[PDB]
Design a protein around this nucleic acid. Structure first.
Ligand code: K
Ligand code: K
Ligand code: K
Ligand code: K
Ligand code: K
Ligand code: K
Ligand code: K
Ligand code: K
Ligand code: K
Ligand code: K
Ligand code: K
Ligand code: MG
Ligand code: MG
Ligand code: MG
Ligand code: MG
Ligand code: MG
Ligand code: MG
Ligand code: MG
Ligand code: MG
Ligand code: MG
Ligand code: MG
Ligand code: MG
Ligand code: ZN
Lengths: 206, 147, 38, 174, 59
RNA sequence: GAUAAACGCUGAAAGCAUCUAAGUGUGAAGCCCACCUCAAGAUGAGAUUUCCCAUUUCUUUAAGAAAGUAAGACCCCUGAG
RNA sequence: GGCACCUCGAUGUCGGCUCGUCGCAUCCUGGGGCUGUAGUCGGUCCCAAGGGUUGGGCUGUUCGCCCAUUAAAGCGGCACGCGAGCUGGGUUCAGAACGUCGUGAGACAGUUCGGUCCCUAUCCGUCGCGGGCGUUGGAAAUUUGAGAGGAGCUGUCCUUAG
């Protein structure tokens, strides 16, 4: 099971028995199967899924031709889902949030929020040097290494661009599925800025 | 008189040979194959020009490993990250990636330069008896008396 | 198990053998006499 | 004074079917098949089997006995079968078999279930007695040792699963 | 030249070292520059030399 | 899944014994997977779906040079997650 | 400790901070044999380096003692890793004083208070980010995974069962 949606935001919900839990709202207007890949043709089995209708002027003849088989408008996000029952899927079929049920354990993937150029303290959780006692060592990344190699070993962690990484959060709970609104409520928080693409898949560890 | 022959690129015709690796020790197979790839078997051999032939190696899964090489011959590789030394045994390679076993053995026996790297591409290794290169009309290279 | 460079029979029931390229001593009488060269 | 030399006969009416390799011995208990080394030449008279080695080198002296021991083991299992008898000892240790499934209660927080393949079966004359039975000696012994291995005998009170009649050294612990 | 003579020698059922021994036994003074040239340019002549060497080796 | 120490099973050399020689099994936070991420500049440059479609001139048997273009992309501009 | 082979047209010296990385003669956790192993705790040897391996008091200290913890609070290497990354308390530059030695200037066979830590990174290396061309018609998407990186710890309680 899987679906593509957009991160709407975070809120909270009272459960039965009165517990208050944070939830992330993921809106997933029905996805469309654009292509089915099989061992015969592609060497591996998967379904290609399209989400979020896109204006025609924003699309291409190559892109419009690709979604023609599924008989749908251009789609902004196209992703593949592996390890499913291909026979149960076919081009043009729609995937809705009702595929998931409340209480299902899912894996949620997204692209972490960008943070730009960041130093090794924030990027890698390193320790500052002292702020007083004559210290002139505050937010620096630490020794580059021993003398003997006459070089710096790879994975010496330094400043650089932070965020914008694919991150998967495992074993999250589906709290509610509002099908008329195409909304899935996930307990907890998930990666990504609001309006960014979010991928919900049934937990691999389950 | 400075009349010694020198081969040119493109003038020498490169033939296609099939070598059967079945029950042939890895190194002795590679040594004879390496010579073919370099052109050492032909009188037109010219060190600065590629004049060797193409070799298809079939049945690489059945290549022979004498002694305890199957479990005690270890192929190390380093990712260049600290503690990045990775190892695999020759026996494990023969069962799962027999092309790599043959290609690695032959690679070591070729020159480590542009020409040698070019000559290595003319090697094609297959685990099993069949290859996709019938279009080249390869001919059998009998190596029983060459090893 | 005793692991030592000098493995020798300790009583009349000790038997010297070799498994997988190592001199070993095995005794059906006393498990203390079990030895492996190393 | 040589196993490889000795003669094997065929009691009752078992028949052995030869081949380049993978000899086959069949009879009342079942069918067996084993892949010999091609260096030990076998003679088949009406009811007597004799194996023959090429030379007296260490390598050939070793295997000759093994083939004859292997072939003989093939027969006695087909002809009379093999079994191992285990007598589990404990204040409340008990056994029970349902079909090809043997469930042990040997003091663990959980019961132990043992499964037999087609060539072996469990008898269990009593709940303190287990008897593996089958046609192959490697499998019977190996399975018999797994049952023993679930709870090997211990030296202070004798508890556990022991082979019937095996010597179990006991310590006079204080 | 020696490498080229070796390749041509083997094509005539002979190793380089045996060919030079056989040519020496046959009193042939052709040098390696000339032999390598015959190996490449005039193979029939190289074969005739190889046969004389093989004849000398047998004698 | 393959192993370490370790424990076998069957088994001979060596009528016995024996985990080994052939044959066969058990066995670790370790090894290879399994989980996460990057990844064909993986020059060995992979695969799949879809779009454009065979133009003009000059040289020429040339994998020619040149010119409008097609699909498409960018410049520029309003911006931001 | 011995030697005096590189460096005296200078290779910056202890401890600490920051960053680690490697070895395994393994501190913890995992597997196992023997036990003078009843059980519970242990001893000892074998395998094992995957991860983990505390905060304080005193001292410049390392070390060590102590307090309180912990599954444990391992031992070493990397110019006793790391000062063009930091600190500069210690290591007697110039001041001053004590004990001591000296007729003395001064000195240590010793102590004491106070005392300037420069450098805009060219190259390789490291962490990020672009441009070019390639990948053999030109394009827009989706991809396989050669190979690589990350992660890898563990307590306590209940139950089985007094
Ligand atoms: K590519
Ligand atoms: K100096
Ligand atoms: K260290
Ligand atoms: K122990
Ligand atoms: K470790
Ligand atoms: K302190
Ligand atoms: K202090
Ligand atoms: K130094
Ligand atoms: K400094
Ligand atoms: K420096
Ligand atoms: K440089
Ligand atoms: Mg801190
Ligand atoms: Mg400051
Ligand atoms: Mg270097
Ligand atoms: Mg001794
Ligand atoms: Mg001297
Ligand atoms: Mg200088
Ligand atoms: Mg060790
Ligand atoms: Mg420095
Ligand atoms: Mg005086
Ligand atoms: Mg002094
Ligand atoms: Mg002051
Ligand atoms: Zn003994």
């Amino acid at each position: 099971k899987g679906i593509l949606g957009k991160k709407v935001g975070m809120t909270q919900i009272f459960t039965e028995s009165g517990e208050l839990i944070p939830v992330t709202v993921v809106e997933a207007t029905p996805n469309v199967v654009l292509q089915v890949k099989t061992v015969e043709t592609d060497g591996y089995e998967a379904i290609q899924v399209g989400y979020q209708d896109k204006r025609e002027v924003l699309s291409n003849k190559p892109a419009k031709g690709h979604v023609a088989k599924a008989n749908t408008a251009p789609k902004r996000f196209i992703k593949e889902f592996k390890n499913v029952e291909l026979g149960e899927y076919e081009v043009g079929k729609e995937i809705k949030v009702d595929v998931f049920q409340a209480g299902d354990v899912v894996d949620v993937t997204g692209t972490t929020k960008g943070k730009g150029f960041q130093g090794a303290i924030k990027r890698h959780g390193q320790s500052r040097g002292p702020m007083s006692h004559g210290s002139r060592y505050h937010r620096r990344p630490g020794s580059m290494g021993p003398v003997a190699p006459n070089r710096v070993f790879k994975n010496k962690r330094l400043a650089g661009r932070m965020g914008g990484d694919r991150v998967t959060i495992q074993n999250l709970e589906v709290v509610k599925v509002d099908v008329e609104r195409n909304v899935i409520l996930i307990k907890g928080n998930i990666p990504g800025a609001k309006k960014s693409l979010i991928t919900i898949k049934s937990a691999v560890k389950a | 008189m400075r009349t010694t022959y020198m081969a040119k690129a493109g003038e020498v015709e490169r033939k296609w040979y099939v070598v059967d690796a079945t029950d042939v020790p890895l190194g002795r197979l590679s040594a004879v194959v390496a010579s073919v790839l370099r052109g050492k078997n032909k009188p037109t051999f010219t060190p600065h020009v590629d004049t060797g032939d193409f070799v298809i190696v079939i049945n690489a899964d059945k290549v022979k490993l004498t002694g305890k090489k199957a479990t005690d011959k270890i192929y190390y590789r380093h990712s260049m990250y600290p503690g990045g030394l990775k190892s695999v045994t020759a026996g494990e390679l023969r069962d799962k990636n027999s092309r790599r076993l043959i290609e690695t053995s032959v690679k070591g026996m070729l020159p480590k330069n542009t020409l040698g790297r070019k000559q290595f591409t003319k090697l094609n290794v297959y685990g099993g008896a069949e290859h996709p290169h019938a279009a080249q009309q390869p001919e059998v290279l009998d190596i029983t008396n060459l090893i | 198990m005793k692991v030592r460079p000098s493995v020798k029979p300790m009583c009349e029931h000790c038997k010297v053998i070799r498994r997988k390229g190592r001199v070993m001593v095995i005794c059906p009488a006393n498990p203390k006499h079990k030895q492996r060269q190393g | 004074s040589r196993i490889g030399n000795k003669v094997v006969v065929l009691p009752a009416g078992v028949e052995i079917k030869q081949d380049g390799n993978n000899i086959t011995v069949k009879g009342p208990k079942g069918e067996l098949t084993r892949e010999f080394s091609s260096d030990i030449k076998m003679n088949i008279e009406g009811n007597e089997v004799t194996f023959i080695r090429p030379n007296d080198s260490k390598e050939m002296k070793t295997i000759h006995g093994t083939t004859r021991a292997n072939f003989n083991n093939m027969v006695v299992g087909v002809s009379e079968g093999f079994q191992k008898a285990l007598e589990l000892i404990g204040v409340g240790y008990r056994a029970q078999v349902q079909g090809n499934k043997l469930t042990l209660n040997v003091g663990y927080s959980h019961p132990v279930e043992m499964t037999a393949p087609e060539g072996v079966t469990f008898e269990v004359p009593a709940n303190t007695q287990v008897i593996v039975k089958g046609i192959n000696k490697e499998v019977v012994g190996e399975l018999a040792a797994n049952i023993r291995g679930v709870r090997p005998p211990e030296p202070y009170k004798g508890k556990g699963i022991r082979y019937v009649g095996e010597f179990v050294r006991r310590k006079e612990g204080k | 030249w020696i490498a080229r003579i070796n390749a041509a020698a083997r094509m005539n059922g002979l190793s380089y070292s045996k060919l030079m021994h056989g040519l020496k036994l046959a009193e042939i003074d052709i040098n390696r520059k000339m032999l390598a040239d015959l190996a490449v340019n005039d193979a029939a002549a190289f074969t005739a030399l190889a046969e004389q060497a093989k004849d000398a080796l047998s004698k």
